[PDB]
Structures are given as structure tokens and as C-alpha cells.
Design a protein around this ligand. Structure first.
Ligand SMILES: O=S(=O)(c1ccccc1)N(CC(F)(F)F)c1ccc(C(O)(C(F)(F)F)C(F)(F)F)cc1
Lengths: 15, 279
């Protein structure tokens, strides 16, 4: 997935 | 003046800028530094040397006590010597990237988009937004990026000025700088770039496009309400021309970085995600 291929980026998107 | 929606659109943009752009590079530490030191691939190297060529910079580290460390890179020759400043750059770029991501996050119009899109946009605009922020700390008079205690200086080379200008990236900073823009216009530039309805993977094309137009329009009005000088006629157009050029430099820079990553891997995890570095 596009989300699944961007761990950190996504991980960084929510905090 | 600007409509009341506009006036506050600029405010959320500015607020986001101020809360995520560490203009003094005070939180950028623990970074790497240069140490105190066959036909197919051959053509590859020839290209890499041409890719890292006129991007060569000197690094200065002004310390608290007043000490000053300075690093002059090696002139072209051999191999690996042309990659000695890559790991540090990867850390600067990554530090810059984290900021950009934060920037998009606090922006309300960005959050209300499907995460897939929010990623497509960040993926396709980071470098761009990073260049726009760096431009604000670029001293065209001395060809040096002044980043708090550390500064990056340009190394004079063949042809000199008219030659460097052959480097899109270099030309972009000098022309953009020439427009002596306001913080407001820089942040609008970032927004317009962030909300590019034409980035690959973007799902809600019609909505983003509606948003980019909203920002483009605010920038245009802002310029009218604040710079009526017939001299500033076309300023808005010059800026849009710039954003377009930047989008073109960004496409090449990615290809440029891959070629490098291919020969001498260096990108950080995050950079890999952002540039789609194969593995
Ligand atoms: O103006 S730069 O964006 C810059 C980078 C870091 C700190 C201040 C300013 N630009 C400078 C250069 F002079 F080299 F052109 C730049 C753009 C892209 C890069 C790299 O993409 C990477 F990976 F280091 F980020 C690469 F070295 F690969 F080209 C390096 C420098």
C-alpha cells in the first residue's frame, strides 16, 4: 500500500 | 485588501511556517561530518561526477566559544572523494524534511485530505518546499547558505558565474532571491507547491486543485494589496513561472539522486521513502 510503503512518513503524520 | 478568508489563510500558513521552520538551525545536531582522512558502470560514474559537480560546497562550523572549524572538499579526481559530504547532507536534508512534514500537518486544508493523498503530496513536494525554505537563508551576495552556526559556501569553478547558472538548482536560488520576496509570499509559494493536484498517486484531484487555486488567488491579491508599484506588475506571474521551473528541477534532482544512491548509497530511511529509493 502507499501508506504501507511510507512507515516513518505516515508514522510522522500523526502525533 | 484581502477577503477575510484570505487574511486568515495567510495567517494559518505563517503560523505553520513559524512553528516548524527552525530558521536558526538550533535543533539540528548529532549530524555526521567528513572524516579527517566495468563498462556500464563506468558510464554511470561519469554521470555521477557530473551530478555532484557544481553542487560542491564548503562547510563552516562557527562554534560557541568563537572557534571556527572549516571543511574544504576535495577537487575532482579518483572516486569516493566526491562523496565525502553526502552523509552530512543526508542529515541536513532529513532534518529539513521532518520540518516540512510538520508544516503540512498543522495546515488544516492538508489534514482534511485522505492520508493517501496527504502522502502523495508530501512525497511529491518535500524537495520543493525544502528548496523554498533554504532560499530564505541563502545569501546570493556570497553564494552561501547561512544555517545558524553552520554555513555552506559555493566553490567557484569553470566558467564561473555564467557557468554555475547552467546548473538549474543554482540558477533557481539566484533568480528566486532576486525577487526579494516576503515571508508571506514564500509561505504561499510553499502551499501552492504542496497542493499540486497533478502529483502521481493523488486521488482527490478536483479538491486539491480547488485548494491550489485558492492559494494562488490569495498570493495574487496579496501582491496587489501590498505592492501596487507598477514595477511589481507581473510579480505574481514571475513567481508562478518559478514554481513551474522548480517542479522541473525536482524531477531531475530525484533522478540525479538515484544515480548517486545507485553508485554510492547514502540516503536515510526517510529520504528513501520520499524518493522511492528502490530498497
Ligand atoms: O541549496 S541546497 O538545497 C542545500 C543543501 C543542504 C544545506 C544547505 C543548502 N543544494 C546545494 C548545492 F550547492 F549542492 F546545490 C542541494 C540539493 C540536493 C542535494 C542532495 O540531493 C542530497 F542528497 F544531499 F540531499 C545530493 F547531494 F544528492 F545532490 C545536496 C545539495
Amino acid at each position: 500500500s502507499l501508506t504501507e510503503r511510507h512507515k516513518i512518513l505516515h508514522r510522522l503524520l500523526q502525533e | 485588501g484581502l477577503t477575510e478568508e484570505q487574511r486568515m489563510m495567510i495567517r494559518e500558513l505563517m503560523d505553520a511556517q513559524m512553528k516548524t521552520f527552525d530558521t536558526t538551525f538550533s535543533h539540528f545536531k548529532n549530524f555526521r561530518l567528513p572524516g579527517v582522512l566495468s563498462r556500464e558502470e563506468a558510464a554511470k560514474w561519469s554521470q555521477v561526477r557530473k551530478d555532484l559537480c557544481s553542487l560542491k560546497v564548503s562547510l563552516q562550523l562557527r562554534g560557541e566559544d568563537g572557534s571556527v572549524w572549516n571543511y574544504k572538499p576535495p577537487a575532482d579526481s579518483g572516486g569516493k572523494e566526491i562523496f565525502s559530504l553526502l552523509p552530512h547532507m543526508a542529515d541536513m536534508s532529513t532534518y529539513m524534511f521532518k520540518g516540512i512534514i510538520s508544516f503540512a500537518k498543522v495546515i488544516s486544508y492538508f489534514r482534511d485530505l485522505p492520508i493517501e493523498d496527504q502522502i502523495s503530496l508530501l512525497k511529491g513536494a518535500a524537495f520543493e518546499l525544502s528548496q523554498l525554505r533554504f532560499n530564505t537563508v541563502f545569501n546570493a551576495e556570497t553564494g552561501t547558505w547561512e544555517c545558524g552556526r553552520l554555513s555552506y559556501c559555493l566553490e567557484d569553478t569553470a566558467g564561473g558565474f555564467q557557468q554555475l547558472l547552467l546548473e538549474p538548482m543554482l540558477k533557481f536560488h539566484y533568480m528566486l532571491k532576486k525577487l526579494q520576496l516576503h515571508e508571506e509570499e514564500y509561505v504561499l509559494m510553499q502551499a501552492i507547491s504542496l497542493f499540486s493536484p497533478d502529483r502521481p498517486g493523488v486521488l482527490q484531484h478536483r479538491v486539491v486543485d480547488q485548494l491550489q487555486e485558492q492559494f494562488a488567488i490569495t498570493l495574487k491579491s496579496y501582491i496587489e494589496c501590498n505592492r501596487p508599484q507598477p514595477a511589481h506588475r507581473f510579480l505574481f506571474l514571475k513567481i508562478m513561472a518559478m514554481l513551474t521551473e522548480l517542479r522541473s528541477i525536482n524531477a531531475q534532482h530525484t533522478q540525479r539522486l538515484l544515480r548517486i544512491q545507485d553508485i554510492h548509497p547514502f540516503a536515510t530511511p526517510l529520504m528513501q521513502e520520499l524518493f522511492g529509493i528502490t530498497g
